[PDB]
Design a protein around this nucleic acid. Sequence first.
RNA 1: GCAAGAUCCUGGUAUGCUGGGGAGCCUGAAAAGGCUACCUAGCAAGACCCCUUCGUGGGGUCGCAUUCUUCACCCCCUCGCGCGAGGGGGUU
DNA 2: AGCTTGGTGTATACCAGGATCTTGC
DNA 3: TACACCAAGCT
Length: 1105
Amino acid sequence: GTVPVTWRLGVDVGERSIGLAAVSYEEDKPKEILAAVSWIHDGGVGDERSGASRLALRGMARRARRLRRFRRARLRDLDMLLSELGWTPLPDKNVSPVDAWLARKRLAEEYVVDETERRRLLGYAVSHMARHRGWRNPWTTIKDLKNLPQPSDSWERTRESLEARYSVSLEPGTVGQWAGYLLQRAPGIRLNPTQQSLSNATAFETRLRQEDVLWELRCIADVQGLPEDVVSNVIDAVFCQKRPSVPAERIGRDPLDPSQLRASRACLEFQEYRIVAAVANLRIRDGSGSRPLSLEERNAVIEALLAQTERSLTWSDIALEILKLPNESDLTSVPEEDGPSSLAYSQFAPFDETSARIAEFIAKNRRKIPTFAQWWQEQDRTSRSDLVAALADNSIAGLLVHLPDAELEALEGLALPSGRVAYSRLTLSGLTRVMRDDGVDVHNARKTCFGVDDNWRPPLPALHEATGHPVVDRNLAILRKFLSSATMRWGPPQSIVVELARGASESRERQAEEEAARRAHRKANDRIRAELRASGLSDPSPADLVRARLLELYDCHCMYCGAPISWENSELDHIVPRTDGGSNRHENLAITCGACNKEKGRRPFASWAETSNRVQLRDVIDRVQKLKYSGNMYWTRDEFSRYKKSVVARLKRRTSDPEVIQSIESTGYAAVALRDRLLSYGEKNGVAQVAVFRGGVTAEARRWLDISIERLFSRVAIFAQSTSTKRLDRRHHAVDAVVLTTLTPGVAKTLADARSRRVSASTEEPQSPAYRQWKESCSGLGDLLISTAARDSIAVAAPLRLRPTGALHEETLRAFSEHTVGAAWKGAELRRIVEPEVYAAFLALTDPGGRFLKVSPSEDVLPADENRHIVLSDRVLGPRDRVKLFPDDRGSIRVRGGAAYIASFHHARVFRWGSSHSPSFALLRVSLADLAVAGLLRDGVDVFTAELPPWTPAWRYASIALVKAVESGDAKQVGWLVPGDELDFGPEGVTTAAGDLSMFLKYFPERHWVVTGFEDDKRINLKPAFLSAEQAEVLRTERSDRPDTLTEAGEILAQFFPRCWRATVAKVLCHPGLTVIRRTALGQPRWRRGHLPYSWRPWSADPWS
RNA sequence: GCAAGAUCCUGGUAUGCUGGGGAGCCUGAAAAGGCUACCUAGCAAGACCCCUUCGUGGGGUCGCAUUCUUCACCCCCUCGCGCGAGGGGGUU
DNA sequence: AGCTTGGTGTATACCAGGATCTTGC
DNA sequence: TACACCAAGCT
Ligand SMILES: [Mg+2]
């Protein structure tokens, strides 16, 4: 069904959104908007406040499980060792709570004569030290831990603070003695400082280290006279830490031999490859030109580089001593940073550094390891390269020599070079063998050995392959679904245009730094706005604010010339002129005095001045170094030191600072990854070109095309001055993408030049034949955009989460309540009955035929019946015998002998009952705990349709009308809803509005809403699909601070958000013509039932099957 | 060659929560309640694998990611000689 | 008595390195 | 953070 049309793809990438457009083109002018959709994604984020991704929380939970399992294994091993030595471990109960601490204190203070008591206290102390060993660097081995200073410096300062606070001298002041003494002397003291939460200083204030516990253990061994073998055994069993590896398939494959794994720095193949390659780059000046060096010369330099032991041969000592030339200037192509007096040659040439390190460590331990040293010197170079490949790559999960526990231990802790070079060791050897013989470079040996063509490149990642970054993977998945659907619809695109708009590769740390920085940017500007308005300024310009800030900080000082200045004597001085490669930044400006202003003369500032009279450097830069931070000004603490060192680094320039550089279309991770994947798709499908722009760019394209979002979507003006931003309406992303289908790199370069000249202040229209051709080609694009916005065609969809995977319950365990069988049972207490079989029995008492429990929470269901017996399957419950109940009347499950609340709901099943002209609706809210305890988290279950038992918290805490209707049999499941489902109320909109919602719909007549939650058994939470919560919160903040900068519509929007429409389900689903819109990847609603989620009407939905 | 970021991954730590305890203090002082700490076990529910002592309990791995679950169709990587496990896509 | 709305609890926070990029000279 | 959950107010 594919009809090939000439169409272009436009992709507007954001942090939380992506706008996607397919626009069909007739004659280099846009003809039809085939699809336009904004997709609102979470950026892969699972913790909404900490910024941690879903993958990060999954990895943290997995590693906590691995930690607990290995810790249990090592405690079992210590228990076996203590049973072997006949030492009693600390029991699980019936002991004093300071037996372990007093045991450590007694064994580290005095000698215990009784053998049984000594062994019991020793077992108690060793078991407790295994439970509380403290932290160690995980990459250090046990000997590396044992060679640390004993005790540590941190514990030494903590100990000195402990005498300075308590005036007692414990010798030796170990952590066990100190903690036990402070518990016996000041009971109820806290040993370690807690998180978050009237004041009490804790006993210790630094994190306990493993060397402190190790020092205490050996001190106990010294005082109690333990033999050294059992001391080493208890040390190895207490401090048994697993080795931090780097597991396989996480290390990149070879571009040339993709079965073979990546190679390391310390692999000798890489040092010899670096030597031969760096030799082969070098061009000897011969024949009045650059001729690459001869074979005898390259063999002499390479043989003189693989046999060294230090960084001895440098680039100034190769050209005139081995290459045999008269001049060091006769050699070129040296891949280092250039400088005067051969600054590249001043550093040292690359050499076999791993062999040097191994030779030096041999020279320090050859008497310790003669077998290794003799094997290293005498055995073959291939075998020793394999040996270093087995000692540097041993820190990988997936020891080839089978040597004993101490003959290799002198080198198991050796620190080799570390890293990952782009080729594999087999490929490095293969390309090595066709350099030192044939004298050809990597550029020829790569073709020769593996038989690849001249135009061969490392292969591009496909669209189906992930990146591992959450934001990039979300944008990538949405992009690849849109592109697959558009390719099946209208064939492959003629071109693909992308632009990213900031917000990547920063963790969203810089999000918090951006908001707390625009806070200062828009607050400290108000001071120099209002005080100059009080002065009398009537023409507001940013330059006046900049010079006012410089006067505010520098206190109106020509620092060089003296002569105190004023507002009129400002003379804003650009340190770097734009004729020498600069830009209009606030770093570049310094306040001057007239005499200290014009004398620079385009020369490097504070360099002509120091090479003259009346003025010198070395003082003012020190004053900037000791600059105290003012708490009320533009620049924050994080930008403070960076600004100060940037000012110093541009003041101390003794040469040029080039140049007038403009961005060259590839700067980010997401841009590189998306570009490579779109190039892979294009080379597999026939796309003529693929470009990835920036900015910033499409806003100016809309400005010079005169395209306004408010004229598109008829939005009200939320600000008093000017109109709203584009970021108010989410559809603007797809609008931008539609505009991105019109551009090329040339017209984008002209627009970027227009941006730099307009912000460098104007206003200036762009002049170019390409720009004029672009402007008269896409003149009708705005007409197309109007006819697309009026038809309600630009969709805003959120991707659905249908997998029944995630946190099943809340983390906090809660104590059970207990209730007697023969008392008065309320509805709440009947709802909280933990045991499902006892629960079903109590339902059989209240309603013998009813499958579900229909009780008011406040109703008194049963009285105190003192002769009530509960007949269970295996036993009988007497009227005085207690029954476990959940602590609160809300959804909870049994986990590990404790009660946990259920998590956020995975979905809500929609139930409809009654007459078709006016039916009632309810939501059965289903969480992950419901499917977990119902046995539905197994492979082969439709979790949105499969029935739940009556004892699940979904059916316990459903609405009463839903329970009665399901008992009556007139209620059927007609669909489900997930957080993110789109509700389309149609042209009618929200007819049943009440309260603030009504006045919200007076100014924002929203017909599309998004399911965001299910706050109780009768209410669904909805937010408007086309309106942005981030824009609404920045208007909320601007109402909280700025005076009357919002219109009444902005007031209503700010008061509506973020809780939005907390709606009664009856009020929502009693709207006729309300539909639940599940969209395809192109934004079109899915209305045909296949094997994908389809649009449905709660009014007109039939039951299942 | 080189200063560094981001993304995870691996190894740990200290609290916290619940169950079992209790050193000190407070109520009860007949009695067992509370608080401050500390000791100990567990810290997703669970699923698969292996024992042989066909049972009785004990060891290993996976388990909050890839947002259209499962089902069904199509493509791709590894192993199979179809198909077991991972990815992807599905137009209204 | 049922719908609007206001407030509030929720596991939490560190360390040392290693592998994929990205950079930006 | 935002969602589920707890009451008070408004009519
Ligand atoms: Mg955008």
